[PDB]
């Protein structure tokens, strides 16, 4: 009765208002890239280090 009236009115006479996906973007965190592979670069290459180390600390094992 009143149920029917409400049902009728609600469904028919107004529905969803406008709302854009674009506007949504502002309110969410957007995807961004995982920049950089982050290559490590070789350290201590060559016997330059070795000659340095042999000479530098001469402290013997006790």
């Amino acid at each position: 009765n009143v149920i029917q009236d409400l049902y009728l009115r609600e469904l028919k006479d107004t529905k969803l208002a406008p709302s854009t996906l674009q506007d949504a973007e502002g309110n969410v965190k957007p995807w961004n890239p995982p920049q950089k592979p982050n290559l490590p670069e070789l350290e201590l290459q060559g016997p330059e280090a070795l000659k340095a180390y042999t000479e530098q600390n001469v402290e013997t094992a006790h």
Binding site: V28, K29, P30, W31, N32, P34, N38, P40, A61, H62
Partner: protein
């Protein structure tokens, strides 16, 4: 003097084991970096999606 000598003898061989082992461990951490970037991308993706 013999006592001193005995310490050094055992050291000479065994230290070579650690020497290798230490660098081997360091190698594993290089590979861990590739993992870290995989982990990172997943975390980021999940976060952006959560906001959506």
């Amino acid at each position: 003097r013999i006592d001193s000598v005995s310490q050094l003898q055992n050291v000479a061989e065994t230290t070579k084991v650690l020497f290798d082992v230490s660098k081997e461990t360091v190698e594993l951490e290089s590979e861990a970096f590739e993992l870290k970037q995989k982990v990172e991308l997943a975390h980021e993706a999940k976060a952006v999606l959560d906001s959506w």
